[PDB]
């Protein structure tokens with residue numbers, strides 16, 4: 001078995017909905033990256049890549065690589081998973097912690113787990129997603145952005 | 157085996173001692189929200205539940221449900237642990253990282269480990285608890301709150 | 313197998329370079345502690361000690377004790393690893409997440425991996441190091457300090 005950790009942060013900016021764990025949530029602010037800014041999926045991708053000793057999202061999808069520029073986070077996840085599986089890895093389980101003061105993540109989590117399990121080719125039970133606030137403290141608590149932590153266990 | 161990740165934050169507020177890992181530690185301020193404010197045990201709870209894909213502490217014990225209203229974090233842990241064991245899981249080991257500038261945790265950690273080991277029905281050697289400051293940086297470093305990280309490895 | 317989690321933050325201060333994963337990186341600022349301030353190696357050390365249930369880089373090396381005074385983080389890592397192996401543990405794998413806006417960690421990562429692999433006496437494929445920004449948010453995003461998350465898996 002192999003352990004991986006991922007951490008990601010995206011700042012608010014613009015309007016439109018945000019996308020967390022592949023799920024569109026309505027919010028007064030959008031998430032500025034060039035990513036879609038799926039904090040949950042990027043942190044998960046890093047947790048998975050890190051468990052496979054394949055580096056991170058940046059190493060696999062560099063700015064000077066036209067293939068995945070403008071691709072959504074799920075596409076990046078599936079590709080990362082593809083290269084992880086090519087190395088001989090199977091999915092143990094994943095656990096994702098969304099750190100956000102707002103919006104409320106809870107009702108949207110079931111569909112995140114569905115989306116993640118589809119992309120990783122696994123069951124509901126292998127994917128856990130949870131949310132928490134920083135009790136109005138820090139940059140997350142001041143509503144400046146959303147953080148996310150993810151761990152992943154892989155089998156070879 | 158299965159991994160989970162817990163992360164909790166509680167702001168400083170009021171008087172009395174703080175409760176960390178079941179241990180009441182003398183401090184100038186208390187810890188606020190809901191239950192006794194045990195960031196250590198809530199994060200530990202979330203990590204264990206996250207490993208069992210049972211969501212989080214807030215999912216088992218919602219705001220609305222009066223059943224768990226007024227219960228301390230050790231009671232919440234033992235109940236969460238009961239739900240986890242009812243799913244067929246046993247404990248591999250746990251690691252808790254208390255993120256606080258003060259107060260000093262180090263004298264109280266041996267006692268934290270004892271309480272946790274009893275609540276999870278495991279050996280002391282299966283329980284690790286540690287502390288780190290953020291070197292006066294962030295909300296923890298400014299003494300605004302205590303963060304807590306936790307990881308758990310379950311067996312099935 | 314046993315899980316471990318490490319976390320560390322160090323504030324910027326003085327002149328460069330900074331040392332991250334045993335690698336001196338040119339930067340406008342340095343890192344304050346009376347260590348070399350290696351957040352990566354301290355978080356890794358804590359992750360490993362945590363997995364072994366040996367406490368932390370503080371219980372093992374007291375600030376009061378002048379025995380390990382002036383020691384660099386690689387020496388502390390190797391000593392921690394010696395004591396961990398003395399408990400009968402070997403290395404599964406490690407994953408390290410440097411949380412920093414700057415400097416760019418990417419061209420120094422392979423070196424960190426090599427140093428960590430030599431210090432832990434393991435294969436390079438057993439060591440993963442990654443870096444992430446906080447999108448200019450928090451103390452890391454403002455260039456006040458550097459955080460690091462680490463996870464370890466040990467075998468007995």
Ligand SMILES: Nc1ccn([C@@H]2O[C@H](COP(=O)(O)OP(=O)(O)OCCOC(=O)c3ccccc3N)[C@@H](O)[C@H]2O)c(=O)n1
Pocket residue numbers: 008033034035042056057058059061062063076411412413414415416417418419443444445446447
């Ligand atoms: N101190 C640092 C911080 C980061 N890095 C490298 O830059 C890369 C990008 O850093 P980031 O800004 O923290 O991560 P990212 O989420 O990529 O932020 C940019 C917006 O997101 C993306 O555009 C994106 C997301 C997933 C995959 C590819 C992407 N380009 C990291 O993956 C890492 O390899 C580095 O070398 N040194």
Ligand SMILES: Nc1ccn([C@@H]2O[C@H](COP(=O)(O)OP(=O)(O)OCCOC(=O)c3ccccc3N)[C@@H](O)[C@H]2O)c(=O)n1
Pocket residue numbers: 099100101102103104105106107131132133134135164165189190191198212213214215217218219220224225226227232
């Ligand atoms: N962005 C977010 C942030 C949080 N949440 C949900 O709200 C819950 C509480 O969020 P929090 O405000 O960050 O947690 P905290 O105050 O630390 O409280 C822990 C939750 O446990 C309880 O609610 C509880 C504890 C003891 C007795 C009764 C309780 N209801 C989370 O567990 C999560 O399910 C969410 O859905 N989206």
Ligand SMILES: Nc1ccn([C@@H]2O[C@H](COP(=O)(O)OP(=O)(O)OCCOC(=O)c3ccccc3N)[C@@H](O)[C@H]2O)c(=O)n1
Pocket residue numbers: 255256257258259260261262263286287288289290291320345346347354368369370371373374375380381382
């Ligand atoms: N709330 C807390 C926070 C930390 N601690 C203990 O302090 C120790 C150190 O915590 P820290 O100060 O946050 O981490 P560290 O990176 O070790 O601090 C700076 C390192 O530079 C040094 O000062 C140093 C390091 C090694 C040997 C001598 C040194 N002077 C922890 O391992 C823990 O045992 C604690 O008991 N309670």
Ligand SMILES: CC(C)=CCC/C(C)=C/COP(=O)(O)OP(=O)(O)O
Pocket residue numbers: 099137138139140147255290293294295296297303449450451452459
């Ligand atoms: C999500 C993680 C890894 C939390 C632990 C690190 C920490 C205590 C950051 C402080 O918050 P902050 O940087 O938001 O404080 P501020 O922005 O107020 O300086």
Ligand SMILES: [Zn+2]
Pocket residue numbers: 008009010035037038039042043
């Ligand atoms: Zn991202």
Ligand SMILES: [Zn+2]
Pocket residue numbers: 164165166193194195198
């Ligand atoms: Zn809590």
Ligand SMILES: [Zn+2]
Pocket residue numbers: 320321322349350351354355
């Ligand atoms: Zn340190």
